[PDB]
Design a binder for this molecule. Structure first.
Ligand SMILES: [Zn+2]
Ligand SMILES: [Zn+2]
Lengths: 119, 170, 116, 50, 49, 121, 161
């Protein structure tokens, strides 16, 4: 009891993707790579983790996360299975693309109104 | 539990623990190493002789001495290690297959410190910087957890679990 | 008060305290190098048994842009005077016994924090 | 022997907001089996049965 | 159809009471009950209510 | 089960509880700071307690008031115990019960830097 | 009249006590002999201790600090005015020599600690409708869950289904 489990009707498991397009898209932006960066610049910054690999450093999480979300919504560079974490208490953006991440589809609510209109 | 991507080798585990109890002496359990090694010797073995560099890789801000009083004991503990060679010898002496001579021990220590531990960040010829930064992030997270500024990570939280479907199983 | 590590100047390693028996003063020596420097803090170690840490020092201005954090209008900011503001508990382990909130202004370029 | 814990970061479920120690947000089932149950209290009741 | 009214009134009263207890705890008025910490006594009062 | 008159009134039972409850310095100490004060009369910190009473270091182990009153202790017995437990090797200069801060001064008379750390721990 | 002493330590302690009692000039206003009071205090301390050991020196230092404490000159004024006899002052403890505000704060802290050390009484609906079979009294408390009965005075525990 409690060990055997069953998926939900809507539960879906990510099949898996590749991290290269995400790395390229994040490298084009104003993101200093971790290999060449002043250690004193890590405090007032947010650490980006992709598939558990610490790479790069950014100085504007509030815009980077929004850009990533819009890009994923448009389904052009990042597949719908990828998930981007925003940790607010500690500045860390941990992105994962490996398989096995159970997920489900949810509607989007911008301010107080959904996008699933009559159209 | 580190694992690069479905590699031939199995996933490797890195336990960076701390003694309860001087007190507050941080240790590590590297793969193929039966005994424990303090984190500072590991940092010096990765190619960081200077203490300031080690602290910067571990601790990101020096304006909080309260975090810093915690690392001073362990940092004073392993002080008879400055150069890279002695650190490599010390780490290789605890290997499962200790080389009968010194050169074999150095080679074994370098191989275990560049292929066994943290293979996901990189197993190329020049990747010690990213490994050191990842280890420093680990120690920083451990120190934050010890101070209580960040709650512990729940073991049963599915956000930290992965499902192996027919693909990976086959 | 607290005490900071002050690295060496040549070898950039930890400087341990040393009580000069000759001049009867406090020095910080290096084990590897032979660097010396006259102290000014006159302190070596402090222990906070009560651990009276100011939670405001840990709180950051970025907490305001939190979609899953409560907001109230009855606790306006002080400096800018904006109405909207957030509130939350210590959100830190080891919490002795207190759910005292830490109001943070929710407005750009302010990042103010206070407590009532 | 305690109320429903905070499985997520300082909240029981994603629906409820952080630091919500209210009764309905910690397992208190306000409805009855005759008048149906809210999904959140349904899940908490499942936790108790388990 | 009157018992429903009484039950709803009682539930609303209990909700108001627990909200008041939460407000008092937030503003630091609820003193710690003997033998227990602040969180422990807060939880005990809520459970009793 | 209390036997004397303490069984009825709680005032004479609280002391019984306190004496049956384990109290250490950690329960009554609030802050502990070591200083390398060269001259005992120099007193790098502003405290009007040393020259009235009269090694290049001392421990300023200030105690809390609320806990001390809860357990109903006095600095005299604390000084006596701290002096007898470690033999006639140190000299604890306690403070009067009239000042606001319950500061103390532990000094050693007769490698030596870490001895104070070890003994305080 | 305190008998004179030829011991150097006793004379130094008496001089220190007299100097401390002279702080604030309360002796001039009260017209009390500071030297006689200091000699009496030293004699009482010596009688209590019976030796010029470390304990006697510590007691003398504590008395000097208490009398010279500017945060509570009322104790010094009462001592110089005869309110506290020298024997009582010498035999008095640190808690008794504290100022009125300090004494009130200590009493409040002790009362708060005594209250907090207590344990919360078991809740229940107290009523006199149930007669306890272990004491014959009617006072008791009930709890519905089966209704458990808890005796109020006797403490008889039972349940009714
Ligand atoms: Zn040096
Ligand atoms: Zn503001």
């Amino acid at each position: 009891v409690g060990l055997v489990k069953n998926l939900a009707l809507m539960a879906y498991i990510s099949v898996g993707s590749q991290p290269s397009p995400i790395l390229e898209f994040l490298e084009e932006w104003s993101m200093e790579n971790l290999e060449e960066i002043s250690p004193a610049a890590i405090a007032d910054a947010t650490k980006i983790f992709v598939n558990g690999c610490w790479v790069g450093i950014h100085k504007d999480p509030e815009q980077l996360m929004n850009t990533l979300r819009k890009l994923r919504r448009q389904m052009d560079i990042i597949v719908s299975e990828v998930s981007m974490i925003r940790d607010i208490r500690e500045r860390e953006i941990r992105i994962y693309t490996d398989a096995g991440r159970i997920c489900r589809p949810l509607l989007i609510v911008e301010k107080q109104k959904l996008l699933l209109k009559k159209r | 539990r580190s694992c690069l991507e479905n590699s031939s080798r199995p996933t490797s585990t890195i336990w960076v623990s701390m003694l309860a109890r001087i007190g507050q002496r941080i240790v590590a359990t590297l793969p193929y190493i039966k005994q424990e090694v303090p984190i500072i010797i590991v940092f010096r073995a990765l190619g960081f002789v200077s203490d300031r560099d080690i602290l910067e890789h571990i601790i990101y801000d020096f304006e909080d001495p309260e975090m810093m009083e915690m690392v001073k004991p362990s940092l004073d503990e392993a002080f008879v290690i400055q150069e890279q060679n002695v650190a490599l010898n010390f780490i290789g002496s605890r290997g499962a297959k200790p080389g009968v001579t010194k050169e074999k021990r150095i080679k074994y220590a370098k191989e275990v410190l560049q292929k066994e531990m943290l293979p996901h960040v990189g197993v190329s010829d020049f990747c010690e910087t990213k490994k050191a930064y990842f280890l420093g992030y680990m120690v920083h997270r451990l120190l934050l957890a010890a101070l209580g500024r960040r709650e512990l990570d729940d073991r049963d939280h599915y956000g930290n679990k992965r499902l192996d479907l027919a693909g990976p199983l086959l | 008060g607290f005490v900071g590590i002050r690295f060496c100047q040549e070898c950039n390693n930890m400087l341990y305290p040393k009580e000069d028996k000759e001049n009867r003063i406090l020095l910080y020596a290096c084990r590897n190098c032979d660097y010396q420097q006259e102290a000014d803090n006159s302190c070596i170690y402090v222990n906070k048994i009560t651990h009276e840490v100011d939670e405001l020092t840990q709180i950051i201005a970025d907490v305001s842009q939190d979609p899953t954090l409560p907001r109230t209008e009855d606790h306006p900011c002080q400096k800018c005077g904006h109405k909207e503001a957030v509130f939350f508990q210590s959100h830190s382990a080891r919490a002795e016994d207190a759910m005292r909130l830490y109001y943070v202004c929710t407005a750009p370029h302010c990042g103010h924090r206070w407590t009532e | 022997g305690k109320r429903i814990p905070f499985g997520f970061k300082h909240r029981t479920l994603p629906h409820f907001i952080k630091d919500d120690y209210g009764p309905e947000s910690r397992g208190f089932v306000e409805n009855s089996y005759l008048a149906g149950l809210t999904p959140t209290e349904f899940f908490f009741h499942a936790m108790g049965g388990r | 159809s009157k018992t429903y009214q009484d039950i709803q009134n009682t539930i609303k009263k209990a909700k108001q009471d627990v909200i008041e207890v939460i407000e008092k705890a937030h503003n630091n008025e609820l003193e710690p009950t003997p033998g227990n910490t602040l969180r422990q006594t807060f939880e005990n009062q809520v459970n009793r209510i | 089960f209390l036997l004397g008159q303490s069984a009825r009134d709680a005032e004479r039972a609280k002391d019984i509880l306190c004496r049956l409850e384990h109290t250490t310095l950690r329960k009554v100490t609030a802050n502990t700071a070591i200083y390398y004060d060269p001259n005992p009369q120099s007193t790098v910190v502003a405290e009007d307690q040393e020259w009235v009473n009269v090694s290049p270091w001392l421990l300023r182990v200030e105690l809390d008031r609320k806990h001390m009153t809860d357990r109903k202790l006095t600095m005299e017995q604390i000084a006596e115990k701290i002096n007898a437990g470690f033999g006639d090797d140190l000299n604890c200069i306690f403070n009067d019960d009239n000042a606001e801060k319950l500061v103390l001064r532990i000094r050693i008379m007769n490698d030596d830097d870490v001895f104070l750390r070890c003994i305080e721990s | 009249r305190a008998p004179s002493t030829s011991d150097s330590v006793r004379l130094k302690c008496r001089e220190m006590l007299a100097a401390a009692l002279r702080t604030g000039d309360d002796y001039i206003a009260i017209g009390a002999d500071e030297e006689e009071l200091g000699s009496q205090i030293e004699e009482a301390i010596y009688q209590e201790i019976r030796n010029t050991d470390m304990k006697y020196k510590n007691r003398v230092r504590s008395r000097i600090s208490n009398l010279k404490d500017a945060k509570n000159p009322n104790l010094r004024k009462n001592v110089l005015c005869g309110n506290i006899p020298p024997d009582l002052f010498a035999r008095m403890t640190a808690e008794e020599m504290a100022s009125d505000e300090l004494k009130e704060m200590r009493k409040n802290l002790t009362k708060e600690a005594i209250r907090e050390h207590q344990m919360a009484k078991t809740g229940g609906t107290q009523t006199d409708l149930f007669t306890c079979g272990k004491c014959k009294k009617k006072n008791c408390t009930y709890t519905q869950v089966t209704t458990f009965v808890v005796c109020n005075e006797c403490g008889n525990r039972w349940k009714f289904c």
